[PDB]
Nucleic acid binder design. Structure first.
Ligand code: DTP
Ligand code: CA
Ligand code: CA
Ligand code: CA
Length: 341
DNA sequence: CATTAATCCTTCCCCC
DNA sequence: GGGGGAAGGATTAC
């Protein structure tokens, strides 16, 4: 099997560069203003200019302006990036019909039935990069190996504007010499549980009784990590349908007053129903981020799909339920819709 | 300071 | 005992 993964480079910022090319060369920071005080918010992403100086995603916009007061700061326009992403995906779609659009920025391609070895793969890689560069003026990085996970890892090593092949020989070496923390799916919390069990490389998973590993990190991750270390991992590249749509907003200020929070919530619902576009959910969840950044949520599945007015009144009850069951003030409020017909 | 969504886990619950 | 499905939370990653 030959898997080709494609990840677009500093994507939102690159798109903002593409739409106003003057930005090239300057440090560009795409960020999400939360409407509280001025420059309250976080960084969605930044280009490599900004990222050289520690300005990355998640950091507050205030920390970034301390570091790079004279960088260009731009509000996020996801719908634009979304439309551009769709178009790029369609190019890739003309190199295989076996394609998993994982996210706005990433896609994997099964090209087993197209090319025949890792050289031809490399060629296919360049001519795809070359294409997206021509057609859309966007830099991507390309990673190639025998499964999805190693193809993704390949790309992470290669970025930016890279291409890399991990042939069946280097996989064997990486099972031994790659940090478990650099495996897809192993966030902080998992990585620290694996150091405690004395697992710092992929191979050390074999060392331990399955049933203990299952205890610490769950069966599914255990099996995933085990299969990976045995050169046995091989999930198929499959299309994926969106299962959930929703939206959270930040309030100008924290609150527990029902009437103060309602309008934020109703706005969240309307934006959600527009985004649904002829999709009908049987389930609704109200989510709240509390003053100290804990997350609480309350849901309901219906035997039928949900009208807009039903969502309005049902959300208010669920919000009432959240307030009655947690005494903290609420910072962000929103909805998620799911279980489409 | 701190701005969408998938999948997994645990706990209930109903019931053969 | 165990299937099935719902709720609420935990974790990850973009
Ligand atoms: N923490 C975040 N908050 C909001 N949006 C994010 C966050 N992280 C990533 N994104 C968005 C912005 C990115 O342009 C896009 C893909 O992220 P990702 O591929 O991880 O990095 P990147 O595309 O910014 O640069 P690169 O791929 O070169 O690291 O998703
Ligand atoms: Ca990515
Ligand atoms: Ca990227
Ligand atoms: Ca990781």
């Amino acid at each position: 099997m030959i898997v080709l993964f494609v990840d677009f480079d500093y994507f939102y910022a690159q798109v903002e560069e593409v739409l106003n090319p003057s930005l090239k060369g300057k440090p560009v920071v795409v960020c999400v203003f939360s409407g509280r005080f001025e420059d309250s918010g976080a960084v969605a992403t930044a280009n490599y200019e900004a990222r050289k100086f520690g300005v990355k995603a998640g950091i507050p916009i205030v920390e970034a302006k301390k570091i790079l007061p004279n960088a260009v700061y731009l509000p996020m326009r996801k719908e634009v990036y979304q439309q551009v992403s769709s178009r790029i995906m369609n190019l890739l779609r003309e190199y295989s019909e076996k394609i998993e659009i994982a996210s706005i920025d990433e896609a994997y391609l099964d090209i087993s039935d197209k090319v025949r070895d890792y050289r031809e793969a490399y060629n296919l890689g360049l001519e795809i990069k070359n294409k997206i560069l021509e057609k859309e003026k966007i830099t991507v990085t390309v990673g190639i190996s025998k499964n999805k996970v190693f193809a993704k890892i390949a790309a992470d090593m290669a970025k930016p504007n890279g291409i890399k092949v991990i042939d069946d020989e280097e996989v064997k070496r990486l099972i031994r010499e790659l940090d478990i923390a650099d495996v897809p799916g192993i966030g902080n919390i998992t990585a620290e549980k694996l150091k405690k069990l004395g697992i710092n490389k992929l191979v050390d998973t074999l060392s331990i009784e399955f049933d203990k590993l299952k205890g610490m990190i769950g069966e599914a991750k255990a099996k995933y990590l085990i299969s990976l270390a045995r050169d046995e991992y091989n999930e198929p590249i499959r299309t994926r349908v969106r299962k959930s749509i929703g939206r959270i907003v930040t309030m100008k200020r924290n609150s527990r007053n029902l009437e103060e929070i309602k309008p934020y919530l109703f706005r969240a619902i309307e934006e959600s129903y527009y985004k649904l576009d002829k999709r009908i959910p049987k389930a609704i969840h109200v989510v709240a981020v509390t003053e100290d950044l804990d997350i609480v949520s309350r849901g309901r599945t219906f035997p039928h799909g949900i009208s807009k007015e039903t969502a309005y009144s049902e959300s208010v009850k669920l919000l009432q339920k959240i307030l009655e069951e947690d005494e903290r003030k609420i910072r962000r409020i929103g909805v998620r819709f799911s279980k489409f017909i």
